[PDB]
Amino acid sequence: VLSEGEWQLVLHVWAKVEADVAGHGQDILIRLFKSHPETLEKFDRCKHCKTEAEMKASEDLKKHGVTVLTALGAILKKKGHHEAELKPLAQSHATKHKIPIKYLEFISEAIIHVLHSRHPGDFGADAQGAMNKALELFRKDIAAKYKELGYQG
Numbered sequence: 001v002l003s004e005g006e007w008q009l010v011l012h013v014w015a016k017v018e019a020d021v022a023g024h025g026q027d028i029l030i031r032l033f034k035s036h037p038e039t040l041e042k043f044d045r046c047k048h049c050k051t052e053a054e055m056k057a058s059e060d061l062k063k064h065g066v067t068v069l070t071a072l073g074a075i076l077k078k079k080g081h082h083e084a085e086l087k088p089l090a091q092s093h094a095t096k097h098k099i100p101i102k103y104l105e106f107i108s109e110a111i112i113h114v115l116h117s118r119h120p121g122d123f124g125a126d127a128q129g130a131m132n133k134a135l136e137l138f139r140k141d142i143a144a145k146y147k148e149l150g151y152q153g
């Protein structure tokens with residue numbers, strides 16, 4: 001459980017993300033792919049991609065950064081009451097994309113990195129701890145759903 005004040009810190013910095021969803025999504029995926037190249041293997045079309053400018057010019061990759069942040073933003077705005085939003089996400093990522101929980105840890109790290117880089121004034125220790133708690137809860141719940149679907153994380 002997060003406190004109401006913790007959720008408000010989460011949603012405060014998320015409003016900043018929403019001013020430029022696509023640019024934040026780009027930075028988060030590029031950070032993910034740099035820090036953890038193996039994850040890039042999960043995206044058929046930019047498997048070949050090599051440079052940051054290639055990732056930044058890529059139309060696909062920008063659309064997926066938006067897809068991620070749109071879904072996650074709706075989950076965060078549910079303040080933990082996200083079972084209905086996690087059901088389809090767990091379904092696809094456990095049975096079709098096969099995304100282990102450690103890759104969700106990786107992307108949570110990249111999200112926190114980008115939010116700190118871009119909004120330090122809105123992402124001090126209080127707010128970083130809140131966001132970390134919120135992404136931890138997301139990963140915990142989706143992991144339980146993975147197991148329900150027969151996928152061991």
Ligand code: HEM
Pocket residue numbers: 039040042043064067068069071072088089092093097099103104107
């Ligand atoms: C906060 C974490 C994430 C969220 C909210 C998220 C959300 C989404 C959504 C909404 C879609 C499109 C609908 C669907 O297929 O379910 C999608 C597709 C996809 N996701 Fe995720 N995702 C996350 C993490 C990841 C990670 C860490 C990876 C790989 C390392 C990944 C790989 C994929 C792939 C390969 C697709 C299909 C892309 C395509 O075929 O165009 N996702 N994701």
